[PDB]
Amino acid sequence: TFCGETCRVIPVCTYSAALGCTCDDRSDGLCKRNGDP
């Protein structure tokens, strides 16, 4: 539920990706966390 970064027109936040955080992506949105994404 919001990892930390955000996926714009270049999604898949790579910093938070270490956790396996995944964004929803809709041209823009918000990267989600893990455990409680």
Domain boundaries, the chain: 1-37
Q: Return d(Cα 34, Cα 10) in angstroms, integer.
A: 20
Report CA dihedral (29, 31, 5, 8) to the nearest 10 degrees.
-40
φ and ψ at residue 18, rounded to 5 degrees: -55, -35
Query: What is the Cα gyration radius of the chain?
Result: 8
Residue type, 16: S
> In which region does residue 12 sit, left (phi positive, over 0), alpha (psi from -120 to 50) or beta (all else)?
left
